Amino acid sequence: TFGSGEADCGLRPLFEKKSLEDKTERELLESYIDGR
Amino acid sequence: DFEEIPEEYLQ
Amino acid sequence: IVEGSDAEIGMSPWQVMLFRKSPQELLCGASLISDRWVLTAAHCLLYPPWDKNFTENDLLVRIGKHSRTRYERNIEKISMLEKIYIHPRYNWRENLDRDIALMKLKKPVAFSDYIHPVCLPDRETAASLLQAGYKGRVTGWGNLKETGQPSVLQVVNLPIVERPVCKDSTRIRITDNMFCAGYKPDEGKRGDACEGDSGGPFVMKSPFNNRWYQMGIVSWGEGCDRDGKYGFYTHVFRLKKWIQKVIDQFGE
Ligand code: NA
Ligand SMILES: [Zn+2]
Ligand SMILES: [Zn+2]
């Protein structure tokens, strides 16, 4: 809704919330000169 | 091409 | 989406579909930011050059979809609009500068595994993620080629392009309220948004707090995936105060 979202915004019930990655996110994180 | 949606959503 | 692949279930829970009642056709894409506000590109709703001017009553918002043409019983939710707000300085006469619009829904939607909003970036996050080379993702039920429609939601991850390179790719005035993304002809990678995707989100995953933020909106382009061209998006952070205002002036 506003800054940084809504509170429970941005975390997906079937991925982040379960600690599951979707097949191409790696690609993004790697482009930010790699994230861990 | 789309499928009919439940009349109630048009009204 | 040209040269993009099918998405997964629960991949883009914020992705919305704007439907027209009659004819019942896909119009544009949008995203959910709170349980009552959807965000899209203003030209999806108003474009005088082609006599487009939709109002509440002519649209429907389908959330939780995956398939394009089917009424996914028990998975998607359909809401009506209460109000549509366009940016008062949307420039349709020249370069779609400030291509942003807010839609208030009649009643709040409940979230699920398939419905969840996306976050809106704050100054620090914009500053750290809107850099050239960083890839972002775009989704939609748009055309698959310039000239061929998908059955499922498509995705594509594109790099952000250096403003000057964006600028030298066209004769249209790029403002600071727009950014462009895509691969250089030399990168031998393709992809782009196309007709049917406008209004949808461009999100990035924050490697600091694992959250997805919507950095842009599909706005315009010169064709779909032409080598040498890039797609332009609306800069959500630069128009965020606007967003705030109408939301804390007309609801939440
Ligand atoms: Na291109
Ligand atoms: Zn468009
Ligand atoms: Zn076009």
What angle (nearest 5°) sits at the alpha carbon of residue C170, between those of residues C4 and C120?
55
Q: How far apart are CA C153 and CA C5, in angstroms?
A: 8
Asked whether residue C230 falls in the same domain as residue C243, the answer is no
Report the b/e string of C178-217 with b at 16+ CB within 10 A: bbbbbbeeeeeeebbbbebbbbbbbbbbbbeeebbbbbbb
In this complex, is the C-beta atom of C157 within 8 Å of any C-beta atom belonging to chain A? yes
Asked whether residue C128 falls in the same domain as residue C227, the answer is yes
Residue type, C103: M
3-class secondary-structure state, position C58: helix
Which residues of chain C make contact with B9, given a CB cutoff of 8 A? 60, 78, 80
Q: What residues are paired with C159 via a beta bridge?
A: C135
Q: Which two tokens stand for residue C199?
A: 């209004």
- Contact indicator for C236, A33 with CB cutoff of 8 Å: no
Asked whether residue C8 falls in the same domain as residue C122, the answer is yes
Q: Answer yes or no: do B9 and C70 touch at CB < 8 A.
A: no
Cis peptide before C23 (omega within 30 of 0): yes
Asked whether residue C124 falls in the same domain as residue C5, the answer is yes
Q: How far apart are CA C234 and CA C136, in angstroms?
A: 14
Q: Which two tokens stand for residue C80?
A: 């009506």
Kindly tell me whether chain C and chain B come into contact, counting contact as 3+ Cβ pairs under 8 Å.
yes
Q: Could you give the C-alpha distances from C53 to C23, C50, C70, in angstroms and in order? A: 15, 9, 26
Q: How far apart are CA B5 and CA A24, in angstroms?
A: 33
Q: Which two tokens stand for residue C76?
A: 């998607």
What is the number of structural domains in chain C?
Answer: 2
Asked whether residue C93 falls in the same domain as residue C141, the answer is no
Q: Where are the domains of chain A?
A: 1-36
Q: What is the resolution of this structure in A?
A: 2.0
Asked whether residue C123 falls in the same domain as residue C110, the answer is no
How far away is chain A from the Cα of C236, in angstroms, using its nearest Cα? 11
> How far out from the chain centre does Cα C37 lie?
14
Ligand closest to Cα of C140 equals 2
- CA dihedral C182→C11→C131→C101, nearest 10 degrees, is 80
Q: Answer yes or no: do A10 and C119 touch at CB < 8 A.
A: yes
- Contact indicator for A9, C116 with CB cutoff of 8 Å: yes
Q: Answer yes or no: do C71 and B5 touch at CB < 8 A.
A: yes
Asked whether residue C31 falls in the same domain as residue C138, the answer is no
- The phi and psi torsions of C16 (rounded to 5 degrees) equal -115, 165
3-class secondary-structure state, position A28: helix
Q: How far apart are CA C44 and CA C27, in angstroms?
A: 7
Q: Measured between CB atoms, which of A4, A9, A32 is closest to C134?
A: A32
- Contact indicator for C106, C187 with CB cutoff of 8 Å: no
**Active-site residue set of C:** 43, 99, 198
Asked whether residue C221 falls in the same domain as residue C188, the answer is yes
3-class secondary-structure state, position C141: coil
Q: How far apart are CA A6 and CA C216, in angstroms?
A: 17
| CATH value at residue C108 | 2.40.10.10
- What CATH number belongs to A1-36? 4.10.140.10
Q: Could you give the C-alpha distances from C106 to C38, C39, C83, C203, C240, in angstroms and in order? A: 11, 15, 8, 26, 23
How far away is chain A from the Cα of C119, in angstroms, using its nearest Cα? 3
Q: How far apart are CA C213 and CA C115, in angstroms?
A: 15
Asked whether residue C123 falls in the same domain as residue C230, the answer is yes
What distance in angstroms lies between residue C180's CA and the mean position of ligand 3's atoms? 15
Asked whether residue C50 falls in the same domain as residue C62, the answer is yes
Q: Which two tokens stand for residue C174?
A: 């790029």
Q: Which two tokens stand for residue A28?
A: 């993004």
Closest CA to C17 of C8, C3, C30: C30
What distance in angstroms lies between residue A33's CA and the mean position of ligand 2's atoms? 32
Q: Which two tokens stand for residue C210?
A: 């694992």
Asked whether residue C228 falls in the same domain as residue C156, the answer is yes
Q: How far apart are CA C46 and CA C93, in angstroms?
A: 11
- Contact indicator for C66, C53 with CB cutoff of 8 Å: no
Q: Which residues, other chains included, contact A11 with Cβ-Cβ below 8 Å and sequence gap of 6+?
A: A17, C116, C210, C211
Strand C101-105 versus strand C178-181 pairing type: unpaired
Range of the domain at C177: 1-12+118-237
3-class secondary-structure state, position C180: strand
Alpha helices by DSSP H, chain C: 123-129, 163-167, 240-250
> How far out from the chain centre does Cα C189 lie?
22
Q: How far apart are CA C17 and CA C156, in angstroms?
A: 17
Q: How far apart are CA C35 and CA C250, in angstroms?
A: 14
Asked whether residue C126 falls in the same domain as residue C3, the answer is yes
